[PDB]
Design a protein around this ligand. Structure first.
Ligand SMILES: *C(=O)[C@@H](N)Cc1ccccc1
Lengths: 134, 427
RNA sequence: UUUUUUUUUUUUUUUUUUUUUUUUUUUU
RNA sequence: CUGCUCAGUACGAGAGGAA
RNA sequence: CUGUGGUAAUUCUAGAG
RNA sequence: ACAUCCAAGGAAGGCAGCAGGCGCGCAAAUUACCCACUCCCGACCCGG
RNA sequence: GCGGAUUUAGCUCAGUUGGGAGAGCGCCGGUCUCCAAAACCGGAGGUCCUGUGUUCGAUCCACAGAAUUCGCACCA
RNA sequence: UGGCUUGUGGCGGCCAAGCGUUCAUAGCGACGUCGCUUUUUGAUCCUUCG
RNA sequence: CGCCCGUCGCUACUACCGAUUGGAUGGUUUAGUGAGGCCCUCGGAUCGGCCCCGCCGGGGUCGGCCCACGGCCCUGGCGGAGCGCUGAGAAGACGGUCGAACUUGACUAUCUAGAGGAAGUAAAAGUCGUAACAA
């Protein structure tokens, strides 16, 4: 009963072995991405580049490199809807957000951790269906 | 005391800004200490004779070059009226600015130099006495006073023969434009000396007419269409510490009150009036004729520009997907066909517009069709034509709101034609 | 008393993209 | 050699630009 | 509080009763 | 350390208090009405 | 507001001094194959961004627009 | 060092097929040919090792 | 006709190394300098009260018919006006502790530029050899 401190100290230190716990523990989340841990960042379409799918899946994926506002850093982004390219023009303000928990992109996608959802401060769904905007 | 808008127009260097400045001075609207400082600054930069003009011309490029570039607005008050006076540039590069000025005006002072060669130049084929007179007519200015200026100049020296020469030339031309020439004062003045500005001049005994101030009082105030829907073409947009983004412009029709919700077309952005100001005096309401700045909550300066039009939400300004007009062709070096794309100067806006069809050539005097779908138009022709603006443009039918329904057509920096809009297809 | 037993590799590197299909009581 | 007036001038469709 | 004063300007403020 | 107007001499300021502008961004309002309530502050009222 | 660049084939770029454009990919098509990859053949494709001026003639020059860019100015 | 000579270097020149959008010379000139030059370099051995 | 390894050639992205004694940022600071208030040795623009003398006005007593007059005590006005003594009292000023801020460097914490060098990862397949799985 008098050896409480060792178990107390032991737990916290052995705990370091948990990588997600570790992630919160080290100021890394703030600095591991262009966002700074942020869910959404406004950006500019520097170029639009077609890319090739990975493994047996064969496809041309719509990809945009984006210059961020406060951050000012290069970003690799994924264009989502079918003919969004028709509606994506260079240097139009774009809001970007991530896919399924931070880390790995959709298995089909190559090196993109980010998704494009707004064009000119307008959501994607509106351009995509005829009834909304044009 | 009724309010009126005055535009000052005329050929480059003929004396527009010197007149306005000097008039404001002897009317005591300008601090003697400031006139003193301006004069010293003017002399030290090699430009003594610009001391009155520099009351109006403030921009670095205006002062460097000794010309007016864009509009300046000044309030002064006569015996009968309060005027907003608008100083417009003569330089051919900035006739687009002069046109926005005319669109906001109730009356015009045409300033015309009597100096040898200066007059003839202004009245020449490509001169701005000629051009400004034409544009003032088309933007719907009927009341005009002409200041035959620089009578003091040595090559003039108050000569009545020179004066009567410029008057007659000016009369023959002005009558061909449709002006009622018998009614309009031709005052011999010296913007620089002061002759006949506010008091009568001993140097010109032979002159019996009004002084310029007297001529102002003899003007008549225009109809106030408060029952038509609110329309305010924006002339400029400022971003002001305390207010935020404040469009400026003259209320053409309707009324505007603090609290109002307003929309700006063609962008479609909506804000709310925090405040209203005319000549630094805060207002609660503004009616037609009021030349105002209005602060707008919820609107960014980048959303709105000159040539946009503000109306209330229930009756928003019309955006033309296309529009129809009756036009007369003043000048063209070849011919105008379907597809011709001059810039359209309407109210405060200026947007290139493509002629998609020429429905009919008309006899310029009678208005009857002389040919369905002519192969082309040329100088001297009148016509009914269809117009598709290159970018979103606000226009109204002349029959409904005439101040948003009259226009000039310009191309290669010349005035090519004039027009009234007879119909609009809304966006 | 009853048992070994020699022989030993002389010569066998590599094989482009993509591969595929599954679900239940109740008797007439 | 430079400046001030010469002068934003004449000459230019402008850009410009003197002596 | 009387009167007498100066400054582009500020809750400036003298001197005299 | 910012930075406002300079009659060329000078004079000011600390809105991290309400409103209101800008900025910043993924991200938060209006230049309103009032002491009636709750209190509090000044002296024997009822001011603020 | 002012001023410079840039706009040429599906893509990316070269030409030019007014007689009217040229290449690399492309990509597509065919042969072979389950289909591609490789290989081998084949493809003719541009209002030279737009208007006007000049000119006998404008891709080119002049003057004017658009769109993108980049300087500079303005500052309710 | 100086010196003859000037290949080499440098510079002009007659002729005008060409450039120069029309045209040869406004401004330039193939080839071909006449030369001037002695701050390059070269060949020569004349003056200087008494 | 199964899996499978590594160098070498494209293309991209991370991180390591790095000539510039490298640049940028923010915290604690050594030293040299020092505004400004404040305590404190002074100073002393200035102001009033009493000191002495002379002159008049007024109240109360004494020597005078007076009245002026003189003495005491208390005020008013003038000269030696400040000439003798006292008190509070602005500028300034001795020497201070506090201590802004300037410079000169330190030092951490926090990013970062770069010819090149060196891994990897996308990695499907081009090119070399058979290492591992069946002694
Ligand atoms: C703001 O000052 C306006 N009300 C007046 C104005 C100033 C500058 C430019 C345009 C308008």
């Amino acid at each position: 009963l008098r050896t409480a401190r060792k178990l107390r100290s032991h737990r916290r230190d052995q705990k370091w072995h948990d990588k997600q716990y570790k992630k919160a523990h080290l100021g890394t989340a703030l600095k591991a991405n262009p966002f700074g841990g942020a869910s959404h960042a406004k950006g500019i379409v520097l170029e639009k580049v077609g890319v090739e799918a990975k493994q047996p899946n064969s496809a041309i994926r719509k990809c945009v490199r984006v210059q961020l506002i406060k951050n000012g850093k290069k970003i690799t982004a994924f264009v989502p809807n079918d003919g969004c390219l028709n509606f994506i023009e260079e240097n139009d303000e774009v809001l970007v957000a991530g896919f399924g928990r931070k880390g790995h992109a959709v298995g089909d996608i190559p090196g993109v951790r980010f998704k494009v959802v707004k064009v000119a401060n307008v959501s994607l769904l509106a351009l995509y269906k005829g009834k909304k905007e044009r | 005391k009724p309010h009126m808008n005055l535009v000052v127009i005329g050929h480059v260097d003929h004396g527009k800004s010197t007149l306005v400045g000097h008039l404001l001075y002897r009317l005591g609207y300008i601090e003697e200490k400031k006139l003193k400082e301006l004069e010293e600054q003017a002399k030290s930069r090699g430009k003594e004779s610009f001391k009155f003009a520099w009351i109006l011309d403030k921009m670095k490029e205006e002062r460097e070059r000794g010309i007016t570039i864009d509009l300046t607005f000044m309030k002064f008050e006569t015996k009968k009226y309060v005027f907003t006076i608008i100083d417009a540039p003569g330089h051919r590069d900035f006739v687009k600015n002069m046109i926005t000025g005319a669109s906001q005006a109730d009356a015009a002072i045409l300033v015309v130099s009597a100096r040898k060669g200066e007059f003839e130049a202004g009245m020449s084929t490509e001169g701005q006495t000629r051009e400004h007179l034409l544009l003032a007519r088309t933007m719907g200015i009927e009341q005009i006073i002409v200041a035959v200026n620089k009578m003091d100049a040595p090559d003039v020296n108050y000569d009545q023969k020179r004066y009567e020469f410029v008057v007659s030339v000016l009369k023959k031309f002005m009558k061909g434009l449709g002006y009622q020439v018998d009614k309009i004062p031709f005052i011999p003045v010296s913007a620089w000396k002061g002759d006949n500005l506010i008091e009568r001049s001993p140097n010109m005994p032979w002159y019996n007419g009004p002084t310029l101030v007297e001529a102002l009082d003899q003007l008549q105030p225009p109809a106030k269409p408060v029952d038509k829907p609110l329309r305010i073409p924006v002339q400029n947009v400022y971003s002001i510490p305390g207010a935020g983004t404040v469009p400026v412009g003259r209320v053409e029709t309707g009324v505007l009150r603090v609290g109002d919700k307003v929309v700006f077309m063609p962008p479609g952005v909506v804000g709310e009036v925090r405040s209203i100001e005319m000549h630094y005096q805060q207002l609660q309401q503004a009616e037609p004729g009021d030349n105002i700045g209005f602060a707008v909550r919820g609107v960014s300066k980048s959303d709105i520009k000159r040539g946009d039009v503000a109306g209330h939400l229930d009756k928003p300004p019309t955006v033309a997907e296309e529009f129809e007009a009756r036009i007369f062709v003043i000048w063209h070096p070849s011919a105008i066909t379907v597809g011709y794309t001059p810039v359209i100067h309407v109210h405060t806006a200026s947007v290139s517009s493509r002629i998609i069809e020429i429905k009919a050539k008309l006899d310029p005097k009678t208005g009857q069709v002389v040919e369905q779908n002519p192969q082309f138009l040329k100088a001297g022709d009148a016509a009914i034509v269809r117009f598709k603006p290159v970018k979103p443009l606000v226009v109204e039918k002349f029959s409904e709101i005439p101040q948003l329904g009259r226009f000039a057509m310009r191309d290669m920096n010349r005035t090519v034609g004039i027009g009234i809009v007879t119909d609009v297809k809304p966006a």
